[PDB]
Design a protein around this ligand. Structure first.
Ligand SMILES: Nc1ncnc2c1ncn2[C@@H]1O[C@H](COP(=O)(O)OP(=O)(O)O)[C@@H](O)[C@H]1O
Ligand SMILES: [Zn+2]
Lengths: 286, 252, 191, 191, 283, 51, 73, 70, 81
């Protein structure tokens, strides 16, 4: 079981390049390829990738073709160039999971038994990470009865080596705004978090509307998870919670007030020094 | 074959050496402090596919000439002097060639050989086996013969040195050589260090003397701290032969 | 737009649209881009456009371009030079010449080139009595052109400055507005 | 001499157990595709041929490769099982030889139908017209003799090569215990 | 017959990252590879991708070991949608700056003989830092006059480095400006790289740890205030020059107090605001 | 702020200028020359800058 | 031609040195192609450590034009 | 831009540096450092260096050529 | 005569198509290409069907008429040699 997948920026940019070139060729919607990488005791590391021929019928979810001979040849060449990287999984730029993904994963499992799928949205109309990691798992039900092969989410993050970090930072002269202070602690979170939460709740609302009207059938597991969520929603009118909240807020504001007092004294010191300097300069000039 | 040799020579011509240094400390993943034997200290990188757990504070290293990057870690250096000490040839004298010395052979063996074959007896009794012996007597009695017999017939590593030969004109080099010799013994345990003619450097420490005298006494102090000091020796034995035991330091 | 050239065209269209209007909105946008953008060409164009925007009040262009001229970015310094030149063409502004004089020996060759061309544009046709530095700048142009260990772009600027200072014989001036107060489209486009 | 990228569609269905056609239809078809691959390679050294099965849904075993040893070796362990999906198999073959190694090569599909095809006439004719537009030739072998007739196959081939196209083919073999390689003579030579 | 100085070499983000990663991997050696691209016009040499090749050598030289790999790689990239062919080669100079040596010039001569406008790119990994990457593009000068024609100022904007000038710049080879044109998807992905998960933004921070950190910093600020009181009494009995060297090897209470104030304010304000936001959002 | 940034931008090439030896003066002499011991090297009879 | 190259590369001025050691070294593990060094690995023979008369120590991955077995510390 | 410049001046901190010893501070932006090659110098201090850490006889790294305290 | 015309593809893209005697050797072909490109013959490397052509006659390597060859220049970097 994978606990985390680390996708390096070179993999993402290579995926973008593959998508762009196949699109320039034309008549395609999703791109597929291999993810070479390495293992670090349940913390994956995807470092490199290469393109692979792939086509699918836009109507039938059973007419798809992946050139495994080309996959093997290119893997041999990549191994000849860098031995420490071995096949770890496959990637596809499709915005969301397709129905052929389990079949493609079964094909790739003959090259990597613990294959990990990474979906890279090259046109992200959202506010969040661009990578979603999935691992194929057998699901046993209680009423759904037949055990199907379903895709299970795995935490994905972006990391980089020193050279990759240097290159990305050099290339990031598009819009650079570090402001690590309260400004960034207000934009990168708070606003972004609330917007993402609203997006997720809107997705849940859309699904619930579809279910209630009758476009989609009922999923007991989804309904159960929603019940658990609504149960977890806390209550903030309890006297004990209110009192604890006020106590902690008072402590934080004590510290804030002391910091502001220090700031004011420093400002006064600077003003006195500046006035001394200006008076001395005027006296000397006179 | 001639053309194979010529091609090998041409290929070998275009190869540059590597500075040899010592690693003092690792600052980060890709930053080490290295002290070239010349004297200067550099902050240097390390080749990626290198076991950096093996670059401890003291490991010898080969540095690239241009970028000073660490490219290899090497075993501890053995001075040519110490190599020559270890590579002496005491003929093939056997214990049958020595006559009249049975008790002395027994004692010397009890000190050097027995603890290196049957430590269990000493462990059972509850004593650490003795370390050093001093072979003293009139000239021509068989001290060097006994040392040669031990070296030839025993299987441990042997280091033969002459105390007169240990000395050097430059300040501190005699002590440096003693330190290198004992480090060699510690590395190649088990080892026997035979200092023939000890009275050359081991003599009573005077109060009034000269610069050369004080240098020799410093060499002797280094030797004493090596034999018994802050670091125990364990599996290194010592044999010393002198015609003049009277003129020796009580510490020794 | 994401293309730096398209952003530069944006700055230029701001200039041409609000040519000689003294529009505070346009000046605000130009200064924001000049002090914020990531591309030095876009910064240069943003600083340059201020001359077109403010050419009807030459006394004010120095007040906005002095600090930009004294900056860490040579591209913005060149933009300030050319902005002063366009704003005070055919005016012999004392403040403009004073701002340009320190920049004529800037470390950067193209900054020197822009400073020389702007000085020529400003001092076209002006005599010793009218402007007390025309002879000095003439000698400066000659010195730069003659020095054999100076930058080629600085020499280019010096030669162009000599050409501009004595134009049409000596019987022509550069003015972005006609004698009646109307914007001269040929001259705006030419500059 | 003619460049051709020909994908072979082999039938590993449950009707291949039948021993009517020599030592089991599986071995008969093995020898048949052996001769066909050798014929293509001899016809052009650069010609490339691949392999696809028409099992439960489909399975691609060897994409276009100039050599034939790998194709023949993979042909072993083609033990029969499941039904035959003609439309899906041919579509997959079409995709595979659309993703060619060399675009100057021609495109061909040699299909061994040794079992009834459950696809209606309308779907098969639609596939025929699509393949005609895409310029694919389909040599169909009516192996197996489960219907040994125009089992919705002559319509396919005639739709393909309609209007004197003479590009496709349909060789129908009787159950006569004669080597399928011995029987095939039209597509190999008079293609 | 010109070769103008406004010509530029467009390096893709993927190519730059690949070059830098390979160069840094081969820190003591001059690891090398090929650049694929197109010759668009006489004012552009687009570099869209680079792939390393099997090579072996010492710290004084590096050479490729097989050309079959290069041919096969070109073919197998064309088969997947990269018909671009070689337009140059790249190799890394680890710490020597950017320039070409004699062997580099010989290789570039071979590449020029094959294709007229082929270029060489030298990337120095170790001298590269986060903000800036040390990289340059080169081409040779024949045995002739001026190597290029200037129809703009674009060429003369770089101030060639002293090391390159010493090693032969503008005498045996000339530089070409490097530009980093990007597409919309590349820009978006580069911006999105550092974006964190939404839940991380709203997640609070253990109150025990938060209070402990606040307590520690306030306790430190107490001693800093003592030292600040001591330091304020000075600055009048101090020479105008002595003040600067007064803060050399000795702590600066004012600076440390300002830093601690900033950190405390940021942490506490963020925590309080997050607490209130969660209080409302979650019922 | 602008002056700070400009100094930090020219400092990279300002820092590659060669340092200066630190020597101990023995005695001034002659027209304008001085005798200096540049440890660990020997002595020199060096000039003096006009300032 | 090869002999001429050897002669021209053997320019007369040498620097006397003493051979401190004749180490034995072996390859460690697989080295990724693209960046593989013939010295750190792919060297199975005998390597020399020498001390030049200038008091400079050096490691010699390739001994040179003198066979290793002849040299002694 | 100042934050950018600080990160771009660190390329003067290339890996192959020479360890030295910081003896005395002269003016600020200058100092006297004793290299391990056995010679002293009057060199310039990098602006980004934290002057609190420059305790007397503190180990410092100097540029290989310029010998600047880096 | 019966000249044997062989296509010579290059990694860059240029095509140096040329015809040689049917008995032409690999060394002779390399010499002709070096004369054409003004490059030392040791730099160039001819390929054929994913196998480098070392030395000998062209025929026994399978090189007939209308056969594709690839020309990969050697790539070398360093400070000396
Ligand atoms: N007990 C002995 N048995 C045999 N030979 C002896 C004996 N003592 C001395 N020798 C002779 O003396 C020589 C070695 O001198 P040795 O006695 O070992 O050193 P030292 O004379 O310093 O005590 C040998 O050549 C050996 O023949
Ligand atoms: Zn080079």
């Amino acid at each position: 079981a994978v606990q985390k997948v680390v996708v390096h920026p070179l993999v993402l940019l290579s995926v973008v390049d593959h998508f762009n070139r196949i699109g320039k060729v034309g008549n395609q919607k999703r791109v597929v390829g291999v993810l070479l990488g390495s293992w670090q005791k349940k913390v994956l590391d995807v470092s490199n990738s290469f393109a692979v021929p792939f086509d699918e019928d836009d109507k039938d979810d059973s007419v798809w073709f992946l050139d495994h001979d080309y996959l093997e040849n290119m893997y041999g060449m990549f191994k000849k160039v860098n031995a420490r990287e071995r096949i770890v999984g496959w990637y596809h730029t499709g915005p969301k999971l397709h129905k052929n993904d389990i079949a493609i994963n079964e094909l790739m499992k003959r090259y990597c038994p613990n294959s990990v799928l990474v979906i890279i949205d090259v046109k992200p109309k959202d506010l969040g990470l661009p990578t979603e990691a999935y691992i194929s798992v057998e699901e046993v039900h209680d009423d759904g009865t037949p055990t199907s092969k379903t895709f299970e989410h795995v935490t994905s993050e972006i990391g980089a080596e020193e050279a990759e970090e240097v290159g990305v930072e050099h290339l990031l002269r598009d819009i650079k705004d570090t402001t690590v202070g309260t400004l960034s602690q207000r934009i990168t979170n708070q606003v972004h978090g609330l917007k993402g939460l609203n997006s997720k709740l809107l997705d849940i609302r859309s699904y619930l509307e579809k279910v209630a009207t009758g476009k989609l059938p009922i999923n007991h597991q989804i309904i159960y998870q929603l019940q658990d969520v609504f149960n977890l929603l806390p209550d903030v009118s309890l006297q004990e919670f209110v009192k604890a909240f006020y106590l902690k807020t008072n402590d934080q504001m004590v510290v804030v007030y002391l910091a502001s007092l220090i700031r004011s004294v420093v400002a006064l010191h600077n003003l006195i020094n500046n006035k001394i300097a200006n008076r001395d300069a005027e006296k000397k000039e006179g | 074959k001639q053309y194979e040799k010529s091609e090998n020579d041409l290929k070998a011509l275009q190869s540059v050496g590597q500075i040899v240094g010592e690693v003092l400390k690792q600052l980060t993943e890709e930053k080490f402090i290295v002290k070239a034997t010349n004297g200067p200290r550099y902050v240097v990188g390390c080749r990626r596919q290198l076991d950096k757990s093996k670059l401890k504070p003291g490991t010898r290293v080969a540095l690239d000439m241009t970028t000073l990057t660490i490219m290899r870690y090497l075993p501890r250096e053995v001075d040519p002097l110490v190599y020559n000490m270890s590579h002496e040839d005491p003929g093939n004298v056997s214990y049958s060639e020595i006559g009249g010395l049975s008790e002395q052979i027994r004692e010397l063996r009890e000190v050097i050989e027995l603890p290196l074959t049957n430590p269990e007896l000493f462990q059972r009794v509850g004593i650490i086996p003795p370390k050093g012996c001093l072979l003293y007597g009139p000239p021509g009695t068989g001290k060097t013969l006994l040392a040669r017999a031990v070296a030839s017939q025993l299987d441990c590593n042997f280091l033969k040195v002459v105390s007169s030969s240990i000395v050097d004109k430059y300040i501190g080099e005699s002590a440096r050589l003693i330190r290198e010799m004992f480090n060699y013994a510690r590395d190649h345990q088990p080892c026997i260090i035979f200092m023939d003619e000890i009275d050359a450097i081991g003599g009573r420490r005077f109060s009034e003397g000269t610069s050369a005298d004080r240098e020799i006494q410093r060499t002797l102090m280094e030797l004493l701290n090596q034999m018994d000091g802050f670091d125990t020796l364990h599996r290194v034995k010592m044999i010393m032969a002198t015609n003049r035991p009277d003129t020796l330091d009580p510490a020794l | 737009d994401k293309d730096p050239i398209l952003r530069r065209s944006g700055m230029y269209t701001v200039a041409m649209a609000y040519c000689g209007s003294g529009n505070n909105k346009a000046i605000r946008r130009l200064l924001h881009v000049a002090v914020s953008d990531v591309n030095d060409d876009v910064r240069r164009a943003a600083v340059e456009s201020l001359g077109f925007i403010l050419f009807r009040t030459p006394e004010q262009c120095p007040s906005v371009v002095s600090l930009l001229s004294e900056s860490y970015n040579p591209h913005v310094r060149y933009g300030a030079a050319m902005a002063l030149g366009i704003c005070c063409a055919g005016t012999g502004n004392k403040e403009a010449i004073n701002l340009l004089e320190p920049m004529t020996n800037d470390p950067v060759n193209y900054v020197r080139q822009g400073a020389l061309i702007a000085s020529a544009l400003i001092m076209i046709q002006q005599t010793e009595i009218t402007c007390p530095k025309v002879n000095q700048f003439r000698q400066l142009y000659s010195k730069v052109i003659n020095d054999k260990h100076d930058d080629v772009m600085a020499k280019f600027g010096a030669i162009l400055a000599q050409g501009i200072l004595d134009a049409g014989g000596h019987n022509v001036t550069i003015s972005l507005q006609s004698r009646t107060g109307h914007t001269h489209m040929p001259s705006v486009v030419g500059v | 001499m003619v460049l051709e990228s020909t994908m072979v569609c082999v039938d590993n269905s449950e009707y291949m157990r039948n021993g009517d056609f020599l030592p089991t239809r599986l071995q008969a078809q093995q020898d048949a595709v052996n001769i066909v691959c050798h014929s293509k390679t001899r016809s052009n050294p650069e010609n490339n041929v691949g392999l696809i099965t028409l099992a439960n849904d489909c399975e691609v075993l060897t994409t276009l490769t100039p050599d034939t040893g790998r194709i023949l070796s993979k042909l072993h362990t083609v033990q029969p099982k499941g039904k035959i999906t003609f439309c899906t198999g041919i579509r997959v073959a079409h995709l595979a030889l659309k993703h060619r190694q060399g675009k100057n090569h021609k495109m061909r599909i040699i299909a061994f139908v040794g079992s009834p095809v459950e696809d209606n006439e309308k779907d098969l004719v639609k596939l025929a017209k699509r393949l005609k537009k895409e310029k694919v030739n389909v040599d169909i072998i009516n192996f197996g003799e489960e219907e040994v007739n125009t089992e919705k196959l002559t319509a396919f081939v005639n739709t393909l090569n309609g209007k004197d196209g003479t590009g496709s083919h349909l060789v129908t073999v009787p159950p006569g215990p004669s080597l399928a390689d011995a029987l095939i003579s039209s597509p190999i030579l008079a293609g | 017959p010109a070769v103008d100085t406004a010509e530029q070499v467009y390096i893709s983000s993927l190519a730059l990252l690949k070059m830098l990663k390979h160069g840094r991997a081969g820190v003591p050696m001059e690891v090398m590879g090929l650049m694929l691209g197109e010759f668009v016009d006489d004012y552009t040499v687009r570099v869209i991708d680079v792939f390393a090749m099997p090579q072996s050598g010492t710290g004084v030289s590096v050479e490729a070991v097989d050309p079959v790999f290069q041919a096969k790689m070109l073919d197998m990239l064309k088969q997947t949608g990269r018909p671009e062919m070689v337009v140059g080669w790249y190799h890394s100079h680890p710490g020597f700056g950017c320039w070409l040596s004699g062997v580099d010039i010989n290789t570039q001569q071979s590449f020029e003989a094959l294709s007229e406008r082929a270029v060489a790119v030298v990337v120095d990994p170790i001298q590269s830092v986060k903000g800036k990457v040390v990289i340059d593009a080169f081409r040779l000068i024949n045995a002739n006059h001026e190597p290029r024609q200037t129809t703009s100022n674009l060429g003369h904007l770089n101030k060639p480095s002293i090391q390159a000038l010493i090693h032969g710049l503008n005498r045996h080879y000339y530089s070409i400006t490097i530009n980093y044109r990007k597409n919309e998807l590349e820009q978006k992905m580069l911006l999105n790289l550092h974006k964190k998960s939404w839940m991380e933004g709203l997640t609070l921070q253990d109150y025990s740890e938060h209070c402990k950190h606040n307590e520690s910093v306030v306790k430190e600020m107490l001693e800093l205030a003592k030292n600040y009181n001591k330091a304020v009494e000075e600055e009048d009995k101090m020479t105008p020059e002595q003040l600067a060297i007064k803060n050399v090897g000795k702590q600066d209470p004012k600076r440390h107090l300002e830093e601690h104030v900033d950190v405390l304010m940021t942490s506490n304000i963020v925590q309080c605001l997050a607490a209130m936001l969660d209080t409302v959002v979650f019922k | 702020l602008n002056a700070k940034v400009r100094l930090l931008r020219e400092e990279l090439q300002l820092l590659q200028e060669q340092g200066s030896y630190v020597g101990e003066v023995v005695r001034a002499m002659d027209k304008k020359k001085v005798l200096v011991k540049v440890h660990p090297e020997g002595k020199f009879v060096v000039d003096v800058d006009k300032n | 031609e090869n002999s001429e190259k050897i002669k021209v590369n053997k320019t007369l001025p040498y620097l006397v040195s003493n051979v401190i050691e004749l180490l034995d070294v072996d390859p460690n593990d697989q080295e990724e192609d693209g960046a593989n060094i013939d010295l750190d690995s792919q060297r199975k023979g005998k390597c020399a450590v020498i001390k030049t008369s200038t008091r400079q120590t050096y490691f010699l991955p390739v001994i040179g034009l003198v066979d290793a077995e002849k040299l002694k510390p | 831009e100042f934050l950018h410049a600080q990160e771009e001046v660190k390329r003067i901190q290339s890996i192959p540096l020479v360890i030295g010893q910081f003896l005395e501070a002269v003016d600020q932006n200058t100092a006297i450092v004793g290299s391990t090659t056995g010679s002293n110098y009057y060199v310039r201090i990098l602006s980004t260096i934290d002057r609190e850490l420059l305790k007397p006889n503190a180990s410092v790294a100097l540029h290989k050529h310029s010998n600047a305290l880096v | 005569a019966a000249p044997m015309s062989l296509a010579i593809h290059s990694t860059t893209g240029t095509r140096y198509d040329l015809a040689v005697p049917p008995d032409e050797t690999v060394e002779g072909l390399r010499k002709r290409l070096s004369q054409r490109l003004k490059v030392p013959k040791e730099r160039l490397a001819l390929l054929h069907k994913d196998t480098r052509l070392s030395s000998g006659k062209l025929q026994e390597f399978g090189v007939g008429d209308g056969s594709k060859l690839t020309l990969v220049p050697t790539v070398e970097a360093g400070l000396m040699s």
